[PDB]
């Protein structure tokens, strides 16, 4: 009748990301009923059969069906019975009806002569003769034991008042009789619904013990089955079920079309024949909407209980057939694998109990615009305590959809989110109950839920990148390369949903000041739910390493750039007096794998792990190899040219490139010996080659060997000495600079004696020790 409905969201504290949704339901009448009276009519079987005491008691004693029955309607002592029940309302009236059949028909016809009875005219199976007796009354195998009456104390009367017939039922005794005419009841069931209110609740409740052995004549005359004579055997003839089966089927015609329900009770049913289903089938023949049940009682307990049931269906606590629904809007999603925990709450007085499977079902349908359906369908028959709390928990995450959302990666479109803010995002698209009030799915009323509850999703993510700058040996170095102004750094989204990586989703650029090794920013609203990595660039001069040190959930980006190593050449002039020269030196640089290396590195430039540096006076007498790749190895030596008058001496001439490394080349320049001809006597000749030998042992004592650098004229020169001795030739006024020679050796000069053809031969510096430049002078005198 009346009906509360609220719906929220409760954020659960403590849980990123997950809440509770509450649809709850709250029943109210006023008073007893809405106004509908109900009007009920019992029928009893009254048979022989229902007096066998072998009903179980409550209490424990076997008992007699009547007995039973006499205190499942009125009562154990004030006890709810099934009349108390009813006409607690005081609208609500009841009617009751006792059936049980009388022999009105003969079986077969014998013969007493004065002498002797034996079998003469045979009935039982009628091809149409059947012959009765005379004087049977038609319409007497049942009678109303009360009439429509409010009045429960009258009733409980009638009831202890009901008794089963006595004697071997014929036609002619009067009352009921001990077979079972269940034809007999229904029909007086009519005759009173006929008189029953026509704005009531017309309901009829069935109560049989066995099947029903005898049927009604289109006369009213009964017809008994003496095929069923032996208890244990019954079985019947073709025309007596046609007759039966017709019976049922018009009885049912008439009364199923003016009945809001009706209800049957096998009490102890014991016969194979089974005819309360054939019931049942033409009831729903003529109202297939009615409830239309059959219960089945073997105690005085399960008849209290299967009474009760039927006083819980036409008398209601309040509403039924119950189902609330959600469906969830694209922003949140159900935990997998059911830990959602789905519950409807009853609030009892304050207190509150979990429903059971028994009472509440769940569902989930995938909806028809894409969305998920969570249903709460109730036990069909579950009637909602009058004003109770029926509340329907479940706990709900946030989507991608919404994370995005929050990110703002997501556009808010229409009515996704209250006033397009997304801490408002709405989480159900729609939200209903269904119920019923009554008897069976008459009502069935839908509400939709009015409030539609919001809620804001976790925070998006700050990821937080640091670049730290090293120097050669590490950090706490000083940095001696050019840093760039600054970093931009871009934080790339992996996509989940193919291949196409967001590779400018954030970007932030880092201040590179010199002098601050450390430095920090962050990208703000990112979008949590994605692996996420960074782009960084390549610095020239520097090494890069990019490393998450965070966790997935939760990045955090590291940077380091560590400056690459170089090596530089010196070279030291030891006798140094031109200083307008040059020198090359070669380096070997074999890169890590061992492989050799290739590239270009300041002014100087490597091929399969060459190159070579040309030294001189405005170069400040260096070469840098700079940035060269960590490790890298490298051999240095001069250039076979530039040793040329020098004795060279290397420091660090090899090694392995891990720090700045500085190899050395000295130079010594080696002692000369120069010869100089004048002549005396002549003025201009060509007459004029000496031909004078020098003599030249090493410090070593030891005669010179080899061939070393003369220079005459300004031109170089080869000069072999042999076993100390060389010779040359010189013109008036000529010199020769023999270069390399070794240090501290001596020398000695003397003119071939065929060349001092008439000559007085002088000579200055002859011999002498060669511990620098040296200079001797050979005249002549014709
Ligand atoms: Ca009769
Ligand atoms: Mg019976």
């Given at each position: 009748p009346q009906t509360t409905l609220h719906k929220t969201i409760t954020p659960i504290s403590g849980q990123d990301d997950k809440y509770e949704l509450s649809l709850d339901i709250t029943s109210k009448l006023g008073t007893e009923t809405q106004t509908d009276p109900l009007d009920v009519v019992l029928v009893a079987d009254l048979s022989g059969s229902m007096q066998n005491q072998d009903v179980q008691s409550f209490d424990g004693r076997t008992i007699s069906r009547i007995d039973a029955l006499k205190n499942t309607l009125r009562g154990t002592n004030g006890r709810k019975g099934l009349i108390d029940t009813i006409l607690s309302n005081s609208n609500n009236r009841l009617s009751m009806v006792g059936f049980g059949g009388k022999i009105d028909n003969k079986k077969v016809d014998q013969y007493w002569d004065g002498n002797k009875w034996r079998l003469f005219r045979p009935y039982w199976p009628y091809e149409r003769m059947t012959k009765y007796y005379d004087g049977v009354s038609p319409w007497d195998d049942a009678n109303t034991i009360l009439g429509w009456s409010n009045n429960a104390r009258a009733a409980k009367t009638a009831v202890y008042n009901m008794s089963i017939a006595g004697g071997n039922s014929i036609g002619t005794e009067s009352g009921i009789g001990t077979g079972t005419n269940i034809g007999a009841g229904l029909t007086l069931a009519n005759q009173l619904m006929g008189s029953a209110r026509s704005n009531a609740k017309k309901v009829v409740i069935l109560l049989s013990d066995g099947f029903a052995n005898m049927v009604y004549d289109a006369n009213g005359?009964?017809?008994?089955?003496?095929?069923?004579?032996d208890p244990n055997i019954e079985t019947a003839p073709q025309w007596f079920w046609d007759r039966l089966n017709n019976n049922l089927n018009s009885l049912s015609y008439s009364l199923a079309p003016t009945l809001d329900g009706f209800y049957s009770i096998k009490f102890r049913y014991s016969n194979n024949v089974d005819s309360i289903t054939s019931l049942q089938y033409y009831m729903r023949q003529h109202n297939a909407s009615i409830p239309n049940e059959i219960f089945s009682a073997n105690d005085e307990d399960?008849?209290?209980?299967?009474?009760?049931?039927?006083?819980?269906?036409?008398?209601?606590?309040?509403?039924?057939?119950?189902?609330?629904?959600?469906?969830?809007?694209?922003?949140?999603?159900?935990?997998?694998?059911?830990?959602?925990?789905?519950?409807?709450?009853?609030?009892?007085?304050?207190?509150?109990?979990?429903?059971?499977?028994?009472?509440?079902?769940?569902?989930?349908?995938?909806?028809?615009?894409?969305?998920?359906?969570?249903?709460?369908?109730?036990?069909?028959?579950?009637?909602?305590?009058?004003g109770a709390r029926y509340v329907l928990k479940f706990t709900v995450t946030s989507s991608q959809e919404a994370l995005d959302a929050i990110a703002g990666d997501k556009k808010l479109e229409a009515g996704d989110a209250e006033g397009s803010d997304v801490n408002k995002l709405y989480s159900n698209k729609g939200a209903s109950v269904t119920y019923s009030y009554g008897i069976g799915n008459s009502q069935t009323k839908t509400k939709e839920y009015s409030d539609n509850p919001t809620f804001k999703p976790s925070d998006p993510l700050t990821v937080p990148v640091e670049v730290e700058w090293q120097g050669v040996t590490g950090?706490?170095?000083?940095?001696?390369?050019?840093?760039?102004?600054?970093?931009?750094?871009?934080?790339?989204?992996?996509?989940?949903?193919?291949?196409?990586?967001?590779?400018?989703?954030?970007?932030?650029?880092?201040?590179?000041?010199?002098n601050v090794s450390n430095e920090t920013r962050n990208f703000e609203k990112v979008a949590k739910g994605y692996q996420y990595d960074l782009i960084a660039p390549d610095v020239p001069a520097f090494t890069k390493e990019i490393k998450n040190v965070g966790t997935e959930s939760n990045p955090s980006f590291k940077v380091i750039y560590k400056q690459l190593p170089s090596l530089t050449i010196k070279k030291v002039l030891e006798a140094?007096?031109?200083?307008?020269?040059?020198?090359?030196?070669?380096?070997?640089?074999?890169?890590?794998?061992?492989?050799?290396?290739?590239?270009?590195?300041?002014?100087?430039?490597?091929?399969?792990?060459?190159?070579?540096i040309r030294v001189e006076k405005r170069k400040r007498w260096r070469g840098i190899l700079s940035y060269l790749p960590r490790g890298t190895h490298y051999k240095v030596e001069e250039e076979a040219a530039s040793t040329n008058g020098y004795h060279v001496t290397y420091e660090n001439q090899e090694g392995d490139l891990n720090k700045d490394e500085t190899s050395t080349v000295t130079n010594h320049k080696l002692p000369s010996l120069s010869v100089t001809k004048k002549v005396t006597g002549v003025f201009a000749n060509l007459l004029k080659s000496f031909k004078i030998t020098i003599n030249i042992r090493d410090a070593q004592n030891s005669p010179l060997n080899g061939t070393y650098t003369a220079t005459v004229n300004n031109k170089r020169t080869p000069l072999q000495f042999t076993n100390g001795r060389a010779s040359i030739d010189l013109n008036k006024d000529q010199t020769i600079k023999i270069d390399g020679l070794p240090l501290d050796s001596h020398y000695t000069v003397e003119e071939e004696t065929n060349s001092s053809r008439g000559y007085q031969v002088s000579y200055e510096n002859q011999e002498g020790k060669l511990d620098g430049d040296k200079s001797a002078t050979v005249t002549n005198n014709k």
């Open positions: 005359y009964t017809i008994y089955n003496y095929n069923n004579e399960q008849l209290r209980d299967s009474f009760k049931d039927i006083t819980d269906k036409i008398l209601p606590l309040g509403i039924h057939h119950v189902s609330i629904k959600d469906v969830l809007s694209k922003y949140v999603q159900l935990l997998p694998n059911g830990s959602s925990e789905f519950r409807v709450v009853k609030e009892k007085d304050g207190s509150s109990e979990i429903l059971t499977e028994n009472q509440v079902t769940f569902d989930t349908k995938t909806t028809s615009e894409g969305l998920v359906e969570v249903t709460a369908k109730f036990s069909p028959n579950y009637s909602l305590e009058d950090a706490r170095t000083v940095i001696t390369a050019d840093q760039p102004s600054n970093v931009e750094l871009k934080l790339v989204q992996k996509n989940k949903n193919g291949g196409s990586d967001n590779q400018d989703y954030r970007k932030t650029n880092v201040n590179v000041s010199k140094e007096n031109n200083l307008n020269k040059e020198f090359r030196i070669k380096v070997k640089l074999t890169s890590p794998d061992s492989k050799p290396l290739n590239g270009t590195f300041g002014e100087i430039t490597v091929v399969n792990g060459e190159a070579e």
